[PDB]
Amino acid sequence: KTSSISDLKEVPRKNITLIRGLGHGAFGEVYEGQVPLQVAVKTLPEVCSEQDELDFLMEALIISKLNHQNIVRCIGVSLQSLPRFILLELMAGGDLKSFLRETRPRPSQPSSLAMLDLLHVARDIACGCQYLEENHFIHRDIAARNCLLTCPGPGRVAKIGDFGCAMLPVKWMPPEAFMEGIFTSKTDTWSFGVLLWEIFSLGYMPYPSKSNQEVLEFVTSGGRMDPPKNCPGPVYRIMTQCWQHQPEDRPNFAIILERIEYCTQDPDVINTALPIEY
Numbered sequence: 180k181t182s183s184i185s186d187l188k189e190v191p192r193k194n195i196t197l198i199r200g201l202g203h204g205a206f207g208e209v210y211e212g213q214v215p216l217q218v219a220v221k222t223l224p225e226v227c228s229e230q231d232e233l234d235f236l237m238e239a240l241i242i243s244k245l246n247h248q249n250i251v252r253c254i255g256v257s258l259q260s261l262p263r264f265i266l267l268e269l270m271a272g273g274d275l276k277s278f279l280r281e282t283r284p285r286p287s288q289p290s291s292l293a294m295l296d297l298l299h300v301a302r303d304i305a306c307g308c309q310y311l312e313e314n315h316f317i318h319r320d321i322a323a324r325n326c327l328l329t330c331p332g333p334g335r336v337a338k339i340g341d342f343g344c345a346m347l348p349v350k351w352m353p354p355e356a357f358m359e360g361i362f363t364s365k366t367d368t369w370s371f372g373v374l375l376w377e378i379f380s381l382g383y384m385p386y387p388s389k390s391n392q393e394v395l396e397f398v399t400s401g402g403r404m405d406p407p408k409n410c411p412g413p414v415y416r417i418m419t420q421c422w423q424h425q426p427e428d429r430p431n432f433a434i435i436l437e438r439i440e441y442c443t444q445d446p447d448v449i450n451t452a453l454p455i456e457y
Contacts, residue, residue, distance in 0.1 A: 181240040188255035190214050190266060195257055205343050206231060207262070211269060218254050219270065223263040239265050242342060245316070249307030249338045251327060272328025272335055275300065279323065279382030282331070284455045294411070294451050297378050298443045300326075301414075303337035305439050308371055309432035311339070312364040318342065319362055321370035322351050323377040350385045350394050355426060357395060365426035371435065372421030373404075379414055380407035381453065408454040413442045 197210040197220060207222040223235045242253040242265075252268035272278060284291050304326055311318055318339065327340040353369035355361040373385050386394045386404060403422050406415040417438050423429045430438070442448045 190255045192260040217269040219267040221265040247310040270327035275326040276323035300337040307339040368429045411448045
Protein backbone atom coordinates (compact mmCIF):
# COMPACT_ATOMS: atom_id res chain seq x y z
CA LYS A 180 0.00 0.00 0.00
CA THR A 181 1.21 3.50 -0.85
CA SER A 182 0.85 6.76 1.06
CA SER A 183 -2.34 8.71 0.40
CA ILE A 184 -2.32 12.31 -0.81
CA SER A 185 -3.40 13.46 2.66
CA ASP A 186 -0.21 11.86 3.95
CA LEU A 187 1.82 14.26 1.81
CA LYS A 188 2.71 17.53 3.51
CA GLU A 189 1.69 20.19 1.00
CA VAL A 190 3.83 23.28 1.53
CA PRO A 191 2.37 26.63 0.42
CA ARG A 192 4.09 27.69 -2.79
CA LYS A 193 4.81 31.06 -1.19
CA ASN A 194 6.88 29.47 1.58
CA ILE A 195 9.15 28.03 -1.11
CA THR A 196 12.13 29.88 -2.59
CA LEU A 197 14.56 28.52 -5.18
CA ILE A 198 18.11 29.64 -4.40
CA ARG A 199 19.88 28.09 -7.38
CA GLY A 200 20.03 25.11 -9.70
CA LEU A 201 21.73 21.77 -9.17
CA GLY A 202 21.36 20.17 -12.58
CA HIS A 203 18.77 18.59 -14.85
CA GLY A 204 17.09 15.53 -13.40
CA ALA A 205 15.52 12.75 -15.47
CA PHE A 206 12.31 14.73 -15.86
CA GLY A 207 12.71 18.41 -15.07
CA GLU A 208 15.42 20.17 -13.06
CA VAL A 209 16.54 19.99 -9.44
CA TYR A 210 17.11 23.12 -7.35
CA GLU A 211 18.41 24.11 -3.94
CA GLY A 212 15.61 25.85 -2.09
CA GLN A 213 14.33 26.89 1.31
CA VAL A 214 10.96 26.72 3.04
CA PRO A 215 14.40 28.15 7.72
CA LEU A 216 14.74 24.75 6.05
CA GLN A 217 17.20 23.83 3.30
CA VAL A 218 15.62 21.53 0.72
CA ALA A 219 16.28 19.98 -2.66
CA VAL A 220 13.47 20.72 -5.11
CA LYS A 221 12.48 18.33 -7.88
CA THR A 222 10.19 19.86 -10.52
CA LEU A 223 7.66 18.48 -12.99
CA PRO A 224 7.65 20.20 -16.42
CA GLU A 225 4.34 21.94 -17.15
CA VAL A 226 4.53 20.37 -20.59
CA CYS A 227 4.23 16.69 -19.65
CA SER A 228 2.16 13.55 -20.21
CA GLU A 229 -0.85 12.61 -18.11
CA GLN A 230 1.42 9.63 -17.50
CA ASP A 231 4.17 11.89 -16.19
CA GLU A 232 1.60 13.45 -13.87
CA LEU A 233 0.97 9.96 -12.52
CA ASP A 234 4.67 9.11 -12.32
CA PHE A 235 5.49 12.28 -10.39
CA LEU A 236 2.65 11.69 -7.94
CA MET A 237 3.69 8.07 -7.42
CA GLU A 238 7.26 9.16 -6.75
CA ALA A 239 6.18 11.39 -3.85
CA LEU A 240 3.93 8.70 -2.41
CA ILE A 241 6.77 6.18 -2.48
CA ILE A 242 9.63 8.23 -1.05
CA SER A 243 7.24 9.62 1.55
CA LYS A 244 6.53 6.08 2.72
CA LEU A 245 10.21 5.54 3.47
CA ASN A 246 11.53 6.53 6.90
CA HIS A 247 15.20 5.81 7.53
CA GLN A 248 18.34 7.80 8.30
CA ASN A 249 20.20 6.38 5.28
CA ILE A 250 17.44 7.13 2.80
CA VAL A 251 16.92 10.70 1.55
CA ARG A 252 13.85 12.20 3.29
CA CYS A 253 10.85 13.60 1.42
CA ILE A 254 10.12 16.82 3.31
CA GLY A 255 6.91 17.61 1.46
CA VAL A 256 5.44 18.57 -1.88
CA SER A 257 3.87 21.50 -3.65
CA LEU A 258 1.51 19.83 -6.08
CA GLN A 259 -1.28 22.40 -5.92
CA SER A 260 0.73 24.93 -7.94
CA LEU A 261 2.54 24.82 -11.29
CA PRO A 262 5.16 23.76 -11.94
CA ARG A 263 4.76 20.95 -9.41
CA PHE A 264 7.47 20.36 -6.77
CA ILE A 265 8.69 17.48 -4.64
CA LEU A 266 10.79 18.69 -1.69
CA LEU A 267 13.68 16.48 -0.61
CA GLU A 268 16.31 16.38 2.12
CA LEU A 269 19.21 18.51 0.87
CA MET A 270 22.47 16.62 0.50
CA ALA A 271 25.29 19.16 0.25
CA GLY A 272 27.93 16.49 -0.16
CA GLY A 273 26.64 15.60 -3.59
CA ASP A 274 26.80 12.16 -5.20
CA LEU A 275 29.12 9.43 -4.00
CA LYS A 276 30.81 8.65 -7.31
CA SER A 277 31.91 12.26 -7.87
CA PHE A 278 33.06 12.53 -4.27
CA LEU A 279 35.23 9.41 -4.54
CA ARG A 280 36.82 10.63 -7.77
CA GLU A 281 37.34 14.13 -6.38
CA THR A 282 38.78 12.93 -3.09
CA ARG A 283 41.16 10.15 -4.17
CA PRO A 284 44.50 10.28 -2.33
CA ARG A 285 47.08 12.21 -4.35
CA PRO A 286 50.79 12.85 -3.71
CA SER A 287 49.88 16.37 -2.55
CA GLN A 288 47.03 15.00 -0.42
CA PRO A 289 48.14 11.49 0.64
CA SER A 290 45.55 11.28 3.43
CA SER A 291 42.50 12.82 1.77
CA LEU A 292 40.61 9.62 2.57
CA ALA A 293 41.08 6.56 4.80
CA MET A 294 39.82 2.98 4.57
CA LEU A 295 37.52 3.69 7.52
CA ASP A 296 35.88 6.46 5.48
CA LEU A 297 35.00 3.90 2.83
CA LEU A 298 33.78 1.31 5.31
CA HIS A 299 31.47 3.88 6.87
CA VAL A 300 29.92 4.79 3.52
CA ALA A 301 29.45 1.07 2.81
CA ARG A 302 27.84 0.53 6.21
CA ASP A 303 25.54 3.54 5.71
CA ILE A 304 24.23 2.26 2.41
CA ALA A 305 23.97 -1.32 3.63
CA CYS A 306 21.85 -0.02 6.50
CA GLY A 307 19.49 1.75 4.12
CA CYS A 308 19.31 -1.35 1.92
CA GLN A 309 18.44 -3.54 4.90
CA TYR A 310 15.57 -1.15 5.60
CA LEU A 311 14.38 -1.40 1.99
CA GLU A 312 14.57 -5.19 2.09
CA GLU A 313 12.72 -5.61 5.38
CA ASN A 314 10.02 -3.28 4.07
CA HIS A 315 9.75 -5.11 0.75
CA PHE A 316 10.99 -2.30 -1.47
CA ILE A 317 13.21 -3.17 -4.45
CA HIS A 318 15.41 -0.25 -5.58
CA ARG A 319 16.65 -1.66 -8.90
CA ASP A 320 19.41 0.95 -9.33
CA ILE A 321 21.81 0.71 -6.40
CA ALA A 322 24.98 2.41 -7.64
CA ALA A 323 27.47 5.02 -6.44
CA ARG A 324 25.88 7.64 -8.72
CA ASN A 325 22.61 7.20 -6.80
CA CYS A 326 24.03 7.54 -3.30
CA LEU A 327 24.33 11.01 -1.78
CA LEU A 328 26.41 12.51 1.02
CA THR A 329 25.33 14.95 3.74
CA CYS A 330 28.69 16.73 3.50
CA PRO A 331 32.28 16.30 2.24
CA GLY A 332 33.66 16.33 5.77
CA PRO A 333 34.54 13.67 8.41
CA GLY A 334 31.04 13.23 9.80
CA ARG A 335 29.51 12.68 6.37
CA VAL A 336 26.52 10.35 6.13
CA ALA A 337 25.73 8.43 2.95
CA LYS A 338 22.11 7.85 1.91
CA ILE A 339 20.25 6.14 -0.91
CA GLY A 340 18.87 8.73 -3.30
CA ASP A 341 16.51 9.09 -6.23
CA PHE A 342 14.18 6.13 -6.70
CA GLY A 343 13.00 7.27 -10.11
CA CYS A 344 17.52 -1.47 -22.84
CA ALA A 345 20.53 0.67 -23.70
CA MET A 346 19.35 2.46 -20.57
CA LEU A 347 19.51 -0.62 -18.33
CA PRO A 348 22.37 -0.42 -15.79
CA VAL A 349 23.67 -3.80 -16.92
CA LYS A 350 27.04 -3.43 -15.18
CA TRP A 351 25.16 -3.35 -11.87
CA MET A 352 22.71 -6.16 -12.67
CA PRO A 353 22.69 -9.89 -11.87
CA PRO A 354 21.99 -12.33 -14.71
CA GLU A 355 18.34 -13.00 -13.81
CA ALA A 356 17.78 -9.25 -14.05
CA PHE A 357 19.88 -9.07 -17.24
CA MET A 358 18.24 -11.95 -18.98
CA GLU A 359 14.77 -12.32 -17.51
CA GLY A 360 13.84 -8.90 -16.14
CA ILE A 361 13.52 -10.53 -12.73
CA PHE A 362 14.02 -8.14 -9.79
CA THR A 363 14.06 -9.10 -6.10
CA SER A 364 15.88 -8.02 -2.95
CA LYS A 365 18.56 -10.45 -4.05
CA THR A 366 18.74 -8.25 -7.17
CA ASP A 367 19.76 -5.29 -5.03
CA THR A 368 22.27 -7.48 -3.18
CA TRP A 369 24.19 -8.09 -6.39
CA SER A 370 24.08 -4.37 -7.20
CA PHE A 371 25.36 -3.59 -3.71
CA GLY A 372 28.38 -5.73 -4.44
CA VAL A 373 29.17 -3.65 -7.50
CA LEU A 374 28.69 -0.55 -5.35
CA LEU A 375 31.25 -1.96 -2.91
CA TRP A 376 33.67 -2.32 -5.80
CA GLU A 377 32.95 1.26 -6.86
CA ILE A 378 33.62 2.44 -3.33
CA PHE A 379 36.86 0.59 -2.72
CA SER A 380 38.16 1.32 -6.23
CA LEU A 381 37.64 4.97 -5.31
CA GLY A 382 35.10 5.69 -8.02
CA TYR A 383 36.21 3.69 -11.07
CA MET A 384 33.71 2.45 -13.63
CA PRO A 385 32.93 -1.25 -13.01
CA TYR A 386 34.50 -3.81 -15.36
CA PRO A 387 37.22 -1.46 -16.67
CA SER A 388 37.50 -1.52 -20.46
CA LYS A 389 34.42 -3.68 -20.96
CA SER A 390 31.31 -2.47 -22.78
CA ASN A 391 27.79 -3.37 -21.63
CA GLN A 392 27.53 -6.33 -24.00
CA GLU A 393 31.03 -7.51 -23.11
CA VAL A 394 30.05 -7.41 -19.43
CA LEU A 395 26.79 -9.24 -20.14
CA GLU A 396 28.69 -12.10 -21.77
CA PHE A 397 31.48 -12.01 -19.16
CA VAL A 398 29.09 -12.23 -16.21
CA THR A 399 26.80 -14.81 -17.79
CA SER A 400 29.87 -17.03 -18.17
CA GLY A 401 30.84 -16.70 -14.52
CA GLY A 402 33.27 -13.83 -14.89
CA ARG A 403 33.65 -11.48 -11.92
CA MET A 404 35.72 -8.37 -11.16
CA ASP A 405 39.10 -8.77 -9.47
CA PRO A 406 39.65 -6.97 -6.16
CA PRO A 407 40.14 -3.19 -6.34
CA LYS A 408 43.70 -1.97 -5.74
CA ASN A 409 44.67 -2.60 -2.08
CA CYS A 410 41.18 -3.91 -1.23
CA PRO A 411 41.28 -5.91 2.02
CA GLY A 412 40.35 -9.57 1.66
CA PRO A 413 37.33 -9.47 3.99
CA VAL A 414 35.83 -6.68 1.87
CA TYR A 415 36.43 -8.50 -1.41
CA ARG A 416 34.91 -11.61 0.14
CA ILE A 417 31.68 -9.68 0.70
CA MET A 418 31.72 -8.65 -2.97
CA THR A 419 32.11 -12.16 -4.31
CA GLN A 420 29.28 -13.38 -2.09
CA CYS A 421 26.84 -10.78 -3.43
CA TRP A 422 27.81 -11.95 -6.95
CA GLN A 423 26.86 -15.60 -6.61
CA HIS A 424 25.13 -16.74 -9.79
CA GLN A 425 22.07 -18.06 -7.95
CA PRO A 426 20.14 -15.46 -5.94
CA GLU A 427 19.42 -17.98 -3.18
CA ASP A 428 23.18 -18.18 -2.57
CA ARG A 429 23.58 -14.43 -2.07
CA PRO A 430 23.37 -12.97 1.47
CA ASN A 431 20.46 -10.83 2.63
CA PHE A 432 21.33 -7.34 3.82
CA ALA A 433 21.20 -8.29 7.49
CA ILE A 434 24.14 -10.61 6.89
CA ILE A 435 25.88 -8.08 4.66
CA LEU A 436 25.57 -5.40 7.35
CA GLU A 437 27.06 -7.71 10.00
CA ARG A 438 29.97 -8.60 7.76
CA ILE A 439 30.73 -4.94 7.00
CA GLU A 440 30.53 -4.14 10.70
CA TYR A 441 32.97 -6.96 11.42
CA CYS A 442 35.34 -5.52 8.83
CA THR A 443 35.39 -2.20 10.69
CA GLN A 444 36.42 -4.00 13.86
CA ASP A 445 39.46 -5.57 12.19
CA PRO A 446 42.51 -3.36 12.77
CA ASP A 447 44.18 -5.14 9.85
CA VAL A 448 41.38 -3.98 7.57
CA ILE A 449 41.03 -0.36 8.66
CA ASN A 450 44.77 0.26 8.87
CA THR A 451 45.19 -0.72 5.23
CA ALA A 452 46.51 2.19 3.15
CA LEU A 453 44.62 3.41 0.09
CA PRO A 454 46.49 3.60 -3.23
CA ILE A 455 47.89 6.99 -4.26
CA GLU A 456 47.33 8.05 -7.87
CA TYR A 457 50.50 9.20 -9.61
